[PDB]
């Protein structure tokens, strides 16, 4: 129902007497291009089944994202153990400038202006997971004063 | 790497003799020889309709020829031509009394030799092997059936190396006698040559 877009479909494998069989990684992002977004990573002995499966998980794990005219509120750095990612706010006409992964994220996020970089590791998977969290830690001016109130 | 022909395995049960009559140490040899070539000519001019099974009967110049088809219209014509022309050309080459009976096929999606000749085509017509094979099953299963399985083998996509693509859904106990599992086979010619096709349809039981 939202939008759909996969980042990669790798074929892993495994040993076993007489040969090797393979499952199939499949990372997919999904979003309404309007704040609601969710990432998903499915696995199965079939490419289609795999993407299909990533679809189910995608809409499950979701996250609202505080969009200021297509940009992000404040800048944030979030290290998912291995890799690390930066995210910066930018005026209209800047565009989504990032590696292929965080793009899928931010694009299907409804984001349209943002400076970013992948420092550290770069494993697509981990950078994925990383960004999700990062957005999941963005906070609107309200959230701030709302917590910083406690009336 | 074995697997006997499910049919021959269920001969004393389930699947009856496609050709069924009787003779002796003098006739069997020819009656079969002829019976065969008759089925051959029918495979030729008749497949164009979904020629699956082709039952046969004989004894003393009597000859049944009940040919079951998914599209009977093509074996009949408009009212007595396509059906008759064959009766003609048939006995026009046999010294016997024929009878080109025609049954229908209430549902092709439940007849292996049909499912087979089907997926056998799309490959010849160069198409998505995985997709098509998997679709045939999801057709046969969605079509209401207790089990189904289909498999090609050869140069899938036209690669150098051989291969074989597996696909099946719902129970298909090939080891059990009380099972009735329509078996289907079909060729497939391409630029890169031969390609086998197999079909299995678990239906009845007990």
């Amino acid at each position: 129902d939202f939008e759909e877009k996969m980042i990669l479909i790798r074929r892993t494998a495994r040993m076993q007497a007489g040969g090797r069989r393979f499952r199939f990684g499949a990372l997919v992002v999904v979003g309404d291009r309007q704040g609601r977004v969710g990432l998903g990573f499915g696995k199965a002995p079939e490419v289609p089944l795999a993407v299909q499966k990533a679809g189910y998980y995608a809409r499950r794990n979701m996250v609202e994202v505080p969009l200021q005219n297509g940009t992000i509120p404040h800048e944030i750095e979030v290290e998912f153990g291995a890799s690390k990612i930066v995210l910066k706010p930018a005026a209209p006409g800047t565009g989504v400038i990032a590696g292929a992964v965080p793009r899928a994220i931010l694009e299907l996020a409804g984001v349209t202006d943002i400076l970013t970089k992948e420092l550290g590791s770069r494993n697509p998977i981990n950078i994925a997971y990383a960004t999700m969290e990062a957005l999941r830690q963005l906070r609107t001016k309200a959230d701030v004063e709302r917590l910083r109130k406690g009336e | 790497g074995n697997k006997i022909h499910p049919i021959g395995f269920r001969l004393g049960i389930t699947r009856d003799w496609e050709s069924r009559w009787y003779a002796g140490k003098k006739q069997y040899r020819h009656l079969l020889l002829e019976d065969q070539r008759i089925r051959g000519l029918l495979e030729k001019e008749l497949y164009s309709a979904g020629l699956a099974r082709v039952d046969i009967e004989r004894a003393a110049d009597n000859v049944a020829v009940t040919v079951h088809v998914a599209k009977p219209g093509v074996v009949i014509g408009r009212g007595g031509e396509r059906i008759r022309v064959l009766r003609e050309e048939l006995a026009k080459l046999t010294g016997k009394n024929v009878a080109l009976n025609v049954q229908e096929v209430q549902n092709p999606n439940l007849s292996a030799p049909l499912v087979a000749q089907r997926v056998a085509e799309q490959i010849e017509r160069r198409f998505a092997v995985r997709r098509a094979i998997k679709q045939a099953v999801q057709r046969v299963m969605e079509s209401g059936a207790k089990g189904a399985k289909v498999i090609v083998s050869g140069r899938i996509g036209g690669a150098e190396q051989a291969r074989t693509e597996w696909a099946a859904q719902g129970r298909v106990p090939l080891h059990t006698l009380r099972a009735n599992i329509d078996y289907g086979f079909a060729l497939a010619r391409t630029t890169y040559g031969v390609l086998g096709v197999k079909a299995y349809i678990f239906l009845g039981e007990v």
Binding site: - | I4, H5, I7, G8, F9, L11, G12, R15, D16, W17, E18, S19, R20, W21, Y22, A23, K25, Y28, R29, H30, L32, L33, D35, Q36, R39
Partner: protein, 60 residues
């Protein structure tokens, strides 16, 4: 010598000695049963196909 092979197998232009069997289908020369007029292999296929009256899987 395989097409002209099977033709000569019918003619017997000379002594009945040169008369020899021939699988009706495969055109095999050896392992041909007089009863079916067929080679061992093809018949295995027909028997499985059920296209052989009475012929049935034996076991005892």
């Amino acid at each position: 010598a395989r097409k002209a092979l099977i033709e000569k197998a019918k003619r017997t232009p000379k002594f009945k000695v040169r008369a020899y069997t021939r699988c009706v289908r495969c055109g095999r020369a050896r392992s041909v049963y007089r009863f079916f007029g067929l080679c061992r292999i093809c018949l295995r296929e027909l028997a499985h196909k059920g296209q052989l009256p009475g012929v049935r899987k034996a076991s005892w």
